[PDB]
Coordinates of all heavy atoms in Angstrom, one line a residue:
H14 N -41.4 -9.4 20.8 CA -42.7 -10.1 21.1 C -42.4 -11.6 21.3 O -43.1 -12.3 22.1 CB -43.7 -9.9 20.0 CG -43.2 -10.2 18.6 ND1 -42.8 -9.3 17.7 CD2 -43.1 -11.4 17.9 CE1 -42.5 -9.9 16.5 NE2 -42.7 -11.2 16.7
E15 N -41.4 -12.2 20.7 CA -41.0 -13.6 20.8 C -40.2 -14.0 22.0 O -40.0 -15.2 22.2 CB -40.3 -14.0 19.5 CG -41.2 -14.3 18.3 CD -40.4 -14.9 17.1 OE1 -39.8 -16.0 17.3 OE2 -40.4 -14.2 16.1
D16 N -39.7 -13.0 22.8 CA -39.0 -13.4 24.0 C -39.8 -13.3 25.3 O -40.8 -12.6 25.3 CB -37.6 -12.7 24.0 CG -37.7 -11.2 24.2 OD1 -38.9 -10.6 24.2 OD2 -36.7 -10.5 24.2
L17 N -39.3 -14.0 26.3 CA -40.0 -14.0 27.6 C -39.6 -13.0 28.6 O -38.5 -12.5 28.7 CB -39.8 -15.4 28.2 CG -40.9 -16.4 28.3 CD1 -40.4 -17.7 28.9 CD2 -42.1 -15.9 29.2
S18 N -40.6 -12.6 29.5 CA -40.4 -11.7 30.6 C -40.4 -12.6 31.8 O -41.2 -13.6 32.0 CB -41.6 -10.8 30.8 OG -41.3 -9.5 30.2
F19 N -39.4 -12.4 32.7 CA -39.3 -13.2 33.9 C -38.7 -12.3 35.0 O -38.2 -11.2 34.8 CB -38.4 -14.4 33.6 CG -37.1 -14.1 33.0 CD1 -36.0 -13.8 33.8 CD2 -36.9 -14.3 31.6 CE1 -34.7 -13.7 33.2 CE2 -35.7 -14.2 31.0 CZ -34.6 -13.9 31.8
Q20 N -38.7 -12.8 36.2 CA -38.2 -12.1 37.4 C -37.1 -13.0 38.0 O -37.1 -14.2 37.7 CB -39.3 -11.8 38.3 CG -40.4 -11.1 37.7 CD -41.6 -10.9 38.7 OE1 -41.4 -10.2 39.7 NE2 -42.7 -11.6 38.5
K21 N -36.2 -12.4 38.7 CA -35.1 -13.2 39.4 C -35.8 -14.3 40.3 O -36.8 -14.0 40.9 CB -34.2 -12.3 40.2 CG -35.0 -11.3 41.1 CD -34.2 -10.2 41.8 CE -32.9 -10.8 42.5 NZ -32.2 -9.7 43.3
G22 N -35.3 -15.5 40.2 CA -35.8 -16.6 41.0 C -36.8 -17.5 40.2 O -37.0 -18.6 40.7
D23 N -37.3 -17.1 39.1 CA -38.2 -17.8 38.3 C -37.5 -19.1 37.7 O -36.4 -19.0 37.3 CB -38.7 -17.0 37.1 CG -39.8 -16.0 37.5 OD1 -40.2 -16.0 38.7 OD2 -40.2 -15.3 36.6
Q24 N -38.3 -20.1 37.6 CA -37.7 -21.4 37.0 C -38.4 -21.6 35.7 O -39.6 -21.3 35.5 CB -38.1 -22.6 37.9 CG -37.7 -22.4 39.3 CD -38.4 -23.4 40.1 OE1 -38.3 -24.7 39.8 NE2 -39.1 -22.9 41.2
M25 N -37.5 -22.0 34.7 CA -38.0 -22.3 33.4 C -37.3 -23.5 32.8 O -36.3 -23.9 33.2 CB -37.9 -21.1 32.5 CG -36.8 -20.1 32.7 SD -37.1 -18.3 32.3 CE -38.8 -18.2 32.8
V26 N -38.0 -24.1 31.8 CA -37.5 -25.3 31.2 C -36.8 -24.8 29.9 O -37.4 -24.0 29.2 CB -38.6 -26.3 30.8 CG1 -38.0 -27.6 30.2 CG2 -39.5 -26.6 32.0
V27 N -35.6 -25.2 29.6 CA -34.9 -24.8 28.4 C -35.3 -25.7 27.3 O -35.1 -27.0 27.3 CB -33.4 -24.8 28.5 CG1 -32.7 -24.4 27.2 CG2 -33.0 -23.9 29.6
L28 N -36.0 -25.2 26.3 CA -36.5 -26.0 25.1 C -35.3 -26.1 24.1 O -35.1 -27.2 23.5 CB -37.7 -25.3 24.5 CG -39.1 -25.7 25.0 CD1 -39.2 -26.1 26.4 CD2 -40.0 -24.4 24.8
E29 N -34.6 -25.0 23.8 CA -33.5 -25.0 22.8 C -32.3 -24.1 23.3 O -32.5 -23.0 23.6 CB -34.0 -24.5 21.5 CG -34.8 -25.4 20.7 CD -35.3 -24.8 19.3 OE1 -34.4 -24.8 18.4 OE2 -36.4 -24.3 19.2
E30 N -31.1 -24.7 23.3 CA -29.9 -23.9 23.7 C -29.2 -23.4 22.4 O -28.1 -23.7 22.2 CB -29.0 -24.8 24.5 CG -29.6 -25.3 25.8 CD -28.5 -25.9 26.7 OE1 -27.3 -25.6 26.5 OE2 -28.9 -26.7 27.5
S31 N -29.9 -22.6 21.7 CA -29.4 -22.0 20.4 C -28.7 -20.6 20.5 O -29.4 -19.6 20.2 CB -30.5 -22.0 19.3 OG -30.8 -23.4 19.0
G32 N -27.5 -20.6 20.9 CA -26.7 -19.4 21.0 C -26.8 -18.6 22.3 O -26.8 -19.1 23.3
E33 N -26.9 -17.3 22.1 CA -27.0 -16.4 23.3 C -28.5 -16.3 23.7 O -28.8 -15.8 24.8 CB -26.6 -15.0 22.9 CG -25.2 -14.9 22.2 CD -25.0 -13.7 21.3 OE1 -25.9 -13.5 20.5 OE2 -24.0 -13.0 21.4
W34 N -29.4 -16.7 22.8 CA -30.8 -16.7 23.1 C -31.4 -18.1 23.1 O -31.2 -18.9 22.2 CB -31.6 -15.9 22.1 CG -31.2 -14.4 22.2 CD1 -30.3 -13.7 21.5 CD2 -31.9 -13.4 23.0 NE1 -30.3 -12.4 21.8 CE2 -31.3 -12.2 22.7 CE3 -32.9 -13.5 23.9 CZ2 -31.6 -11.0 23.3 CZ3 -33.3 -12.3 24.5 CH2 -32.7 -11.1 24.2
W35 N -32.0 -18.5 24.2 CA -32.6 -19.8 24.4 C -34.1 -19.8 24.4 O -34.7 -18.9 25.0 CB -32.1 -20.4 25.7 CG -30.6 -20.6 25.8 CD1 -29.6 -20.4 24.8 CD2 -29.8 -21.1 26.9 NE1 -28.4 -20.8 25.2 CE2 -28.5 -21.2 26.5 CE3 -30.2 -21.5 28.2 CZ2 -27.5 -21.7 27.4 CZ3 -29.2 -22.0 29.0 CH2 -27.9 -22.1 28.6
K36 N -34.7 -20.8 23.8 CA -36.2 -20.9 23.9 C -36.5 -21.6 25.2 O -35.8 -22.6 25.5 CB -36.7 -21.7 22.7 CG -38.3 -21.5 22.6 CD -38.7 -22.1 21.3 CE -40.2 -21.9 21.1 NZ -41.0 -22.7 22.1
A37 N -37.4 -21.1 25.9 CA -37.8 -21.7 27.2 C -39.2 -21.6 27.6 O -40.0 -20.9 26.9 CB -36.9 -21.1 28.3
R38 N -39.6 -22.3 28.6 CA -41.0 -22.3 29.1 C -41.1 -22.0 30.6 O -40.5 -22.8 31.4 CB -41.7 -23.6 28.8 CG -43.2 -23.6 29.2 CD -43.8 -25.0 29.1 NE -43.4 -25.7 27.9 CZ -42.7 -26.8 27.8 NH1 -42.4 -27.5 28.9 NH2 -42.4 -27.3 26.6
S39 N -41.8 -21.0 30.9 CA -41.9 -20.7 32.3 C -42.7 -21.8 33.0 O -43.8 -22.2 32.5 CB -42.6 -19.3 32.4 OG -43.3 -19.2 33.7

């Protein structure tokens, strides 16, 4: 529930580069 759905080509802003999982905003 906490992770994002996206499609190839989508742009997002990286909020946190914490490990293998990054917080971002579409």
Side-chain angles (χ1 to χ4, degrees):
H14 57 258
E15 281 185 61
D16 64 2
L17 253 176
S18 259
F19 53 86
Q20 304 176 68
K21 51 191 308 188
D23 283 358
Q24 306 163 52
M25 33 208 38
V26 187
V27 178
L28 273 25
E29 284 180 81
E30 297 191 24
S31 295
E33 310 152 312
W34 292 92
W35 297 355
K36 194 170 182 293
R38 181 192 315 125
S39 157

